[model samples]
Target: ELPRNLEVFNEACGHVFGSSFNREDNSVISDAAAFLFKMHTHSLDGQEAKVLRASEKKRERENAKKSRKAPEAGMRVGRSLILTSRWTEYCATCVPALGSKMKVIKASGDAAMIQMMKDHNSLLRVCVRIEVWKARYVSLVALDERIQTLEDAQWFPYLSGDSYRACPGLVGGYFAKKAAAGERGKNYKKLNQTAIIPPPRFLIIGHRLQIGDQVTLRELLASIAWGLCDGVLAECWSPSQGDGSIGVVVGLPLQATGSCFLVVASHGLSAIADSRIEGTGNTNLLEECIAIQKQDGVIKCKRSGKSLYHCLKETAG
Candidate 1:
């Protein structure tokens, strides 16, 4: 054996390790068969994939995987999303500057959320303050979700009901608590009232990473350039489970400029394989009715239809 059959990895990884891998062996491709063999599939096609796009993640902290690596004590998943300047504009990921104090309309009456909204300019100040060292990511534990979701609240004006709910963890409040707590600090407790504590994680975001803060920029450009040559879709899913250690991730960035489908991978396939978001119905099926996929890698898409199945299939799997 060539160590996990190095030749089995024809589809260079798209994520994890920041895309430096080149799994070349002169034959074969990444394996997803073992994963798909006994692995379950929902009716039709978009079910498991929905797990990734669900409006929100589950309640249990267990689903998010906050433990950190052995020696480094680093984050398992960095919730800080890396997006092209293009999609960032339309995705409601960042909050626009306010005209005044009461900028965006409040989404709810959350005390901590309101507190951040009032003094911190919607947590950007806290984000900057916490950005002092800038070693890595956001408000630390417990208060994490509150920060994530609060950022979503500030976008109430620009965000439609769905997008608002879709991105609760955008604020990074949780990281603020953690980074602030680098050694010792009551950042979490003092940040808000215990009675008004916010919620937990979801949206497949990673915890704050202890390392790789530098490689992310490289990974982004590389991904956009060559699908960053990472193992895609099912390719990385199976192996990720087989080893139970951090390594290659599937589905890297595919393009650039004003338009592109941003693919942030799940920390692991566990969520898509098991827990999934519910009641998705026909709400987010963005697709082309007159599209055709050619074997030569040429996509024929005519924006004349719905049923965005191709998008879903190729993006996450």
Candidate 2:
């Protein structure tokens, strides 16, 4: 057996996902506390990296006459979670448009399957990025999402190779449902399941997210996924109402391998397609992500494969 003396964040589902650091340690873990911490920083990603160090310099820079000339090098990069500026932004934009392509998850269809995994990957990597940041800093809860505690931040980790389950898949679960229905809509209230979490059902996905002997990145994702499905995405950077979410769409993957659905999703996807839809320049931004992913090999397949956007272009080609 292992030691039983860790400071816990919360207890649920026969486990305790606690913070490894003690209270005395510089890093403290508290949802409300972390909430306050994220409040003072970031959120306003509009500021420039360079800012005046003193009132005199700031005044000079702001003045029309002096501003024309090159100011002295007294500016410092604005403080914020360096990574948060865009990873979430990238997926937050790209995945949604891809999801828009398939409003519902059809087991017989590839779009839905691919979209499900897309959301899954986005949630997973974002969680990992946060974990990486948290480890480096004190308790910096910079996620724009409204998760109050780490325990509430678990993710849905198991998607079977088979689509035997009846749940609506990821896209059908949260965004689509919410977009199709009103803010309070549960999309499938009449069904056995709903997008909201804690009806305590895992049969849809084929596993439970009990606090592990060790906390995993997947668990962090599961928690967020649960919130999105719960109905009411306003407080969330990531819902709707009902028994739990788009009826449970879970089952085995078609096989152990074969390009993950994200690749199949590219099926003729053109980066410039949605260029004019909304004013966010989402397609352009998504293109930026695809371009970066292509150039830097940023998004990787957990199964050890080529870059994701590259895989899309191949199939959609």
Candidate 3:
């Protein structure tokens, strides 16, 4: 029999999944901590980059002013994740819009599957060969949607060839339920069952955030994602609420083979859609999430991913 003393398996999984356990050495296994440190350092870099870009833009603007040129709207690049996966093709329009820079490289759907395997440095390289595992599962906890600890995962008996079971399938349980409900929303699905690392249940996404009035959801998400990858983002949500609502980022890709990062999520619009609209009064302040997700879809003000927007809208209604 092999020596069980090699706790490398436990040690690595704890790091990748962001879970810590009772240990004697007191070595740090907190990915949350690592991610935050990364955030502060990168945040400084992002600001510096922004300043440089702004100065360059100002020069061009001044030159135009001196030449008496027509007032031109300045342009900046928006960000989008370019997913690298065998299952999903490169999105034709995966390019970022004009305004923000290409921020974080994200993977969802297939690429996410690959990352999941590579993340924990597991005993098995599930990244390239997700088919190896016949069993896979994920779980969430409490009304607040807290993610269960990795050790606490409960299995769901799912098929191997099922498309939704494939790599990059972040929204697995959601779609798997549909498949059970008579093959609803079935398409080119990739089948690669993966273990879900518990990320926050409530992820707020916004493009440009308000100073303090109400931080934009995208900014919040960016901060969190940056943090998890490098560190930071939660203290802001403590105490009282102030607008940033759309529900969590779901599964942030803890693993990634390439530059892609994947995340799974619900529409996050139960409050806005108002299931009881037929009788109950319009949603109140607390229920505003329902209206926003119902009307604007998840990630409220984001004007990209019409499919994601439409999905949230349909679900909310």
Candidate 4:
């Protein structure tokens, strides 16, 4: 039998070093003992080198596997893409307009099953290579119409001093001032006195304003006024109204076609009067009054205030 003392020492060494110790040759296990000792006293740099070496080996293995097989498809499943190019092909269901965005539902070879975010019904499974699809971040907000160009303006008088405040149908100096000034009527830019004049009707396509985009008080009011004339309504909220409450629409006036329609208000159901045949300025004023009266929250006239629109309306008016 082996010496009990040496056998016990070897057993202890094996347990501590994580390896069996040789009983016959002491030097035979000397190198392994030294290596184990080096590992026990290893510095942070040594540990980092070991991790980097392992990472390099893993990358090399991955590269080898990739080279052995065909490269994966560029347009993968569950990825969003923007349609940068206009639709040139004929489709039976939906027309993929220019600047529209879409999401990939599935991919088979080069073809991908995509659905438009604008309209979920617009779905197409087409070859990715045939159509130019760019992988980019597209906002969920609906886009707004903007001014395209500005026309040359002739000399005109400015009306700022005379304040006109009178009841509807009662003529005021406002119309006289406008006529005497020879104002060609309110164009896109002239709608806001300080604003730069814009094109009469053309809408700026790509860089159009979107919902949730920040705007100044003047800009918001102007947009509200324009939306009213177009018979479009927008839901808005102000700081005065608690966030818990639902947002209210910009209660602007509409052209009554002399046809009776049951319109509901805070005071219950009321009949709308015929105010269709009226001056443009009075129409705007009446609409503004309606908006103010219908609004339960405070009217934010400054940019510093916290007032935002849930959504803006669009029409051809």
Candidate 5:
């Protein structure tokens, strides 16, 4: 009776492995299914078995896709931003030089974002450093921002606001401390500080890397590109759980040059499933306004859907 219905097994597997798997005799079908199923289920307890090899192959490809093209460890999210003082035209100059021949599809800040491959697309971040003209220096607005934001004090001690706030005269006093710390070696630091007198120095006019000594080029590009992709937005609102008014993020215009964006939103409470960066008094409509990049630096967007509903439930936990 089993041999009589062997054709049924082949028919089922036809979709699984293809049509040629069928044999002329119905007996072969029954025998093949039982054999193949058993082999797939438990034949390979060995380390280098075929079934395990297939899984390993798939896993290798996935890991390759996820990893940055580097042998060195890269900085994680938010760590790739290289702080630069706003004294030079870094972004404007750097973008063109590095990206000119790289098939740049878009230009943003000092970054010339280029799509390296059309199909399995990858991004290459590039920049160029230039010495701004010394004569131009009464100092620039952009330069002041970077100087003042340093987490540590230097010779100038950041004279952004009041002149009295700065550790006046010259950097000679502070150089003593930096010299002790091995920062000011015998080479160039001393000569420049003394001879140059408000000497023109090179700042990071534009560079694609941050902590390049620690992270590889590939890693730095990935981290910085991710930051641009997942750009933030701040939503303004009145403090009330019930007040649903959300304002449009006017932080920077979409196409504005030299723009920086920062977004923060709280209803005085945590994020809700329906929470949006734009305010609460809006409709259930998904408006085609601005595109915010995802946390992974992918341009994939967020929208309310069944998956969001599932997330809402999970967040409720």
Candidate 6:
């Protein structure tokens, strides 16, 4: 049967190899013909092998597509997901890193739109320093209430009445004491006493005080006995404390030369003391501290010797 098929094979090979054939020849022509015929048969098997491989690969791809279930569109939208994998090329912006919580905004075939939540680092816990004016009595409960209320509303301490108190003691006594320790070389004990502290009324005027911002007064003296430094007491200064007058400097709005005015008052003056200095010839002393590059310096205040007037310097903590 195979021998019968040789004629058919020979006829097909003649078209490709050549038409002429030597009948009794057993050299180049016969050997070459036999080799070509074998190659033809093997070529068909090779083509079938390629077809089988393609079919197997196609079936594998279909199986994988079916097995891999896609998340439901409705479920994914608005759902919070912790990033398990670090995804960068999700959209226009890089997706959140691993462990970051993200809300799925939308999803498509192979992509998703997500918004990252407030990172753990961005959250801020602000501590406000609330001082009460003329608060002879320090209330820890009242202080806590003020801090809690301010924290919730996210507001700076509105030092209005004599109830809102600020002390490191309120947060925790020992810790507060430790923090309000020494300033420069002076101990908390000395600074609180002789220190010419700047009142809240004066400090608040210049800066844009915020809830998160730190207070110099609070940092310097938490709860010391001295008049100005102590938050509980209504700070006051008398003429008896000679050469120790606290003053606040203000830039004159009308002055084109940018000259400033020094408003000096006794520590005895209330926090709500009149901003304007109406100089009564006997009592009030209105003085100007002029700055000059020459002539020793601008005479800030002239000393009358008998009746002394001096400006207190605010040294660093």
TM-score of each: 0.17, 0.17, 0.18, 0.17, 0.14, 0.16
Cα deviation at 252, candidate 3, in Å, is: 16
In candidate 3, what are the lDDT values of residues 11-70, reduced to their tens digit? 333333322322221112122222222222222122212233557776565444445532
Candidate 3 local distance difference test against the native? 0.27
Give lDDT tens digits, candidate 4, residues 1-317: 33332233233234433323342332323332223222222211112122334578765654554345321223111222111112111111223322233343333222322422222221111111001010000000222222122211111111111111111111112443344366464431121211221111101111223333333222333333321122222333232255343233343222211234334355675444444433344653334322222334434221221112222321112
Candidate 1 vs candidate 3: the TM-score winner is 3
The residue pairs found clashing in candidate 5 are: 86-142, 86-143, 87-143, 90-205, 233-263, 234-263, 234-264, 244-280, 246-279, 246-280
lDDT (C-alpha, whole model) for all candidates: 0.24, 0.27, 0.27, 0.25, 0.26, 0.26
Q: After superposition, how far is residue 216 of candidate 3 from its true place, in Å?
A: 15
lDDT of 1: 0.24
Q: Per-residue alpha-carbon lDDT of model 6 for 275-300, expressed as tens digits?
A: 33544444433343222121233223
Worst 10 residues of 6 by lDDT: 119-128
Model 1 is weakest, by summed lDDT over 10 consecutive residues, at 195-204
Model 5: CA > 4 A from native: 1-66, 69-139, 146-180, 183-188, 191-317
Query: Distance (Å) between predicted and true CA of 78, model 1?
Result: 18
- Give the alpha carbon lDDT tens digit for every residue of 83-148 in model 2: 222333332332332223333544447774665444434333222222222322221112324334
User: Could you give candidate 5's per-residue lDDT for residues 233-271 as a string of tens digits?
Assistant: 111011233434322211121321222243445767553
What would the TM-score be for candidate 3 when compared with the true structure?
Answer: 0.18
Better of 2 and 6 by TM-score: 2
Highest TM-score against the true fold, candidate: 3
Question: Local error of candidate 5 at 140, Å?
Answer: 1.3
